Amino acid sequence: ITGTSTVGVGRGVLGDQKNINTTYSTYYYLQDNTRGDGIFTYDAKYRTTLPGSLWADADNQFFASYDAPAVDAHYYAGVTYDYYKNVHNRLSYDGNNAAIRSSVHYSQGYNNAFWNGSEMVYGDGDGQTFIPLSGGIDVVAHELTHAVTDYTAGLIYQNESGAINEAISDIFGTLVEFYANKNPDWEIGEDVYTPGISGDSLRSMSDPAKYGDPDHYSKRYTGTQDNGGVHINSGIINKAAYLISQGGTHYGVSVVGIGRDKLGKIFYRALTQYLTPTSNFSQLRAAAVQSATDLYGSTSQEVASVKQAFDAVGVK
Ligand SMILES: [Ca+2]
Ligand SMILES: [Ca+2]
Ligand SMILES: [Ca+2]
Ligand SMILES: [Ca+2]
Ligand SMILES: [Zn+2]
């Protein structure tokens, strides 16, 4: 919409108060004109038609419980855009400031959120397995990171390249969660998963086996479910990225950690310069080694740690 940029206030899914960028033109819309070609949030009104209606509000105050998921989808897409711009110098997901669109209230009792190739979509959850999925900043950044991958490596969604594609989304979702300093951790989706159980999450990067996902290449899933295990075998790469950052000894192999910032620089470089649509785990290892070589030198500690981490999860 064409109108005047302004700032409204609301409450997110977890009850926290936040300011959001809106546009005024008769109604106040969830349209943030301060980032790129804009961030736009739509109401899918419990249907599956997309994108639905651009979210309109009469007084620029978003404290209704129906407003919550829209507030957080809108706000956390702004934080993800800032992370990619300020840390990696990338303007939106295509690198040319493409508008970011999200729809919330998709379907009824829908336990998922996803990047469909053109925009983000978030269910409200059934209230037991999940609460509205846009309340998790790691979920929002995970999905939007699929858009970055689609415009760069283009990793196909199946078998090892799809597992890499999912791991990349977990890694960057976790880095965004650390960047916003929102009670950060190495788990995925803990803010919106099972509101009645404390301490759990959908997946763990620090110990993927806690939920039964593989943490070593010898335990990979070789069947056909989940497109060849894209959400299961991503644990092998998640564990490797956790080790590179944090260090540790895993199946007898010791890794010195180099921290999150270098982790993010190496993987972003590998993603935007060396991975291709059909890259497999062994090609990911070579891409990450080369990236760390480019940035820090072939005899750096950083290259050494990337090798040890992939050796520790059995990826040669
Ligand atoms: Ca209102
Ligand atoms: Ca957290
Ligand atoms: Ca998390
Ligand atoms: Ca829980
Ligand atoms: Zn994903």
UniProtKB/Swiss-Prot annotation:
Record organism: Bacillus thermoproteolyticus
Active-site residue numbers: 143, 231 (proton donor)
Protein name, entry field: Thermolysin
Organism phylogeny: Bacteria, Bacillati, Bacillota, Bacilli, Bacillales
Family named by the database record: Belongs to the peptidase M4 family.
Role of this protein: Extracellular zinc metalloprotease.
UniProt keyword annotation of Protease present: yes
Keyword terms: Calcium, Hydrolase, Metal-binding, Metalloprotease, Protease, Secreted, Signal, Zinc, Zymogen
Cofactors demanded by this protein: Ca(2+); Zn(2+)
